[PDB]
Symmetry: D2
Subunit: 264 residues, 4 copies
């Protein structure tokens, strides 16, 4: 019979001059109805991690099979690009950095390739983004600066900016990532907003989910407080737990129904 499946493949990036793996979830109907188009969720991993973690430890396919069957989530393409690895040798991060223009890769190469190949609807209304930790920050800032591309953002234990609680080499990959995250602080972006920016932020649906024992809780609180104070509607949840995969797996049961609601 027909079944949802997880596929891992690769795309060569001219921007990065590098092979880029990615892992994709394909709905049960994908091979059955060759004409059907789908919403898409870009689902980003955290630092040190690589593309397969959402399928393998997040159990994306099993959660989707549950929620699709109950109607709580719609069939959608879910994809996780590789933006990680051993931080000492491999570039971690989602923004354009000196020597590593990941964001340019994401929008000019990755997204076009994926949405063509996996039959994504292709409009803003059916494109959402979510992620954990470093990926939560990437998801959030992508939503902030590309509000014309995303209808919803679900930020898990997100690296909204660098916590208050340092590499010896200021020119190492992790040092470069640190400065990139600071420069693109999701908190700062909201705090410095004029009325036009506030109005754009309001065109996006936001959901912030971070555990009470998480070292990034304080930065997510600042993000939520800035949003709430700026009059930008935003859901905020602080559940039991910390910076771990039980938090991120369980977050999927809130995330997938949330983006489904916004898609519709």
């Amino acid at each position: 019979n027909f079944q949802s499946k997880v596929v891992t493949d690769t795309l060569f990036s001219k921007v990065l001059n590098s092979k880029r793996a990615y892992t994709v979830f394909l709905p049960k109907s994908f091979e059955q109805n060759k004409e059907k188009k789908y919403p898409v969720l870009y689902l980003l991993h955290g630092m040190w991690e690589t593309n397969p973690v959402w399928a393998e430890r997040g159990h994306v396919k099993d959660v989707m099979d549950r929620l699709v069957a109950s109607g709580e989530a719609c069939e959608m393409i879910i994809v996780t690009p590789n933006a990680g690895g051993n931080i000492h040798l491999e570039w971690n991060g989602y923004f354009d950095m000196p020597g590593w223009k990941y964001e340019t890769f994401f929008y000019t190469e990755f997204l076009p390739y994926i949405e063509k190949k996996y039959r994504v609807i292709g409009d803003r209304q059916h494109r959402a983004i979510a992620g954990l930790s470093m990926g939560g920050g990437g998801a959030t800032n992508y939503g902030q600066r590309h509000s014309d591309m995303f209808c919803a953002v679900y930020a898990m234990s997100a690296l909204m900016s660098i916590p208050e609680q340092p590499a010896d080499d200021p020119n190492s990959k992790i040092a470069i990532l640190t400065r990139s995250v600071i420069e693109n602080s999701c908190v700062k972006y909201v705090m410095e907003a004029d009325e036009d920016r506030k109005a754009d932020l309001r065109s996006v649906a936001w959901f912030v989910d971070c555990g009470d024992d998480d070292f990034l809780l304080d930065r997510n609180i600042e993000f939520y407080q800035a949003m709430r104070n700026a009059g930008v509607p935003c859901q905020f949840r602080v559940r039991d737990g910390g910076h771990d995969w039980e938090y991120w797996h369980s977050a999927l049961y809130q995330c997938l129904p949330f983006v489904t609601r916004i898609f519709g």
Copy 2:
């Protein structure tokens, strides 16, 4: 055939020179086993409110009947004293105030009377306290300044301090809350105080749309930064009775776990 019940009665306070109404939940076994003793939960109402609201809108009996039957909560006495009413006419608050020493009434009159009359076990390990809004602040500062009396505190949408006519009762309450800021109490703590705070189990529950969220956040950060174990939950919602009724499903099993 035995059933849990809610009873409303009054105590005369010499300390206050005033009748004080209170509403108490009595477990299903109360009339069945006349010799059984129970743990107690003091469950405080918010500003403007009076004693019956936890039974009438919180549906305390219905929730207990559910959670006692599943084993998630133990049988306990639950009691709500009157500490409010129209804020322009009636005294609102839990701390000793000029002319209205509510806290002295609570500890020297109310508590001894309740625990004798309704067969409360009577020690610290079997006494907990919780409340919403003004009552959440009252529960918290009571647990802070009387850690010898309580094993657990569950603070709902709590008036931990004032969010961002000096002879009025409302002005007097306001000064009392600032003076007894639950946030300040943790922030100024020395090592001895931190050790005392650690002897109590703390649970802080406040909605993402609540005007008191920022103060509760301040309280949790102070606790966490001082190394005092504390659960924090921010659930969907605001300063309302759906939040406080649903909080009972976390609070009653929580104090049950802490009870010895």
Copy 3:
């Protein structure tokens, strides 16, 4: 400052020759744009009860205010007609009975009046029905015999059939429920009926301590065996308002998802 509201009003029924009370929930936006139309949920009460019980004990407005704010429910009209009262003095039931043609009242008088008066969109894709106990059986059989009218059915602790003087209202109701057994309707279905049933989304929610659990199990088993998709939940609890109030948090997001 627009607010959602609950309104109780009355309609005269020629079919019944009786005044019929009803209670309706109106969305926050109702008075704000007086040309906006809404989907509708018919939300039925149980035996002995009357129309206002869903607003008063089910806290329908407070639950809607929560779920509308979070986006989990859409704005909808919610309406509860009176179909009960003291069973010894007042007619209880939702089907056409000898001397009391309530179903005829419902479809020929009540529904048209309500959907015109309160700006209901008016098609099947935006009409759903739910109920508890007697009202759960009523909702289920309405959906079964009027699949052209309802896209979704949410049955709480439903009187799917009688669990296991002759001219009293109670005896007449008892016969009516047996004659219109929700279980029977499914077990005797041919291929065309099964296809009709599949055009409706079904959700069945009944607690593990409920005296009607066995009839709901029979109903679900019949549905499942006939290949008619149906969600089934058995949660902790019994035939009580904590069950029915909490069911709302599953029911309202469910019909919202089904609404086209």
Copy 4:
């Protein structure tokens, strides 16, 4: 390295009863290496047919769930252990009861339990011993609790094989095959029949145990779990019953832990 941490350990015990090395996987609390004198309650957590001992740790994520629930106080620290009772059903013995040529229950009670509870510092009484499992393991847990009520205070049965389903059973026409032998064993030890045929003495024994039955609305074993619950209720034996969304799958069994672990903690 500067922290103590809960641990999952896999080891083997040689069984003389079975003439077989029996692997097992055990969860050890964060305090295990830190307070060498602490004794613990124990939960026996059993796997399903076709599976082996490591599945509860690897797919159930038992360590991660315990680390969460221990920190919140919802679960107490406890030893959790899964013995190997499975593997490929055409090659390996599957099952929990004594069968011809494979007396697994005798192994469990006379070899496995004493060895585990000594080695991993279990308190060792009924009041601190619980059992749970999924599918085949759910039937194993339930019937153990039924016939060894003096050993267990609580049973949590997930998607349990309470008896052979009217539909969905694995074909077992070869009477000398291990799968046929298991099938007969499950029938003879029907969890449903055990309650149905109970006299007053048996009912009293059953009431000394806390029972929790948890099975999804789309599970092929739902109908048998319903019969078990109905028999329990009708017999006046207190039992929790939940039917949640889902089927015979690991999302159901992982999420079940979040009810199971606090549940046995309450009963301990």
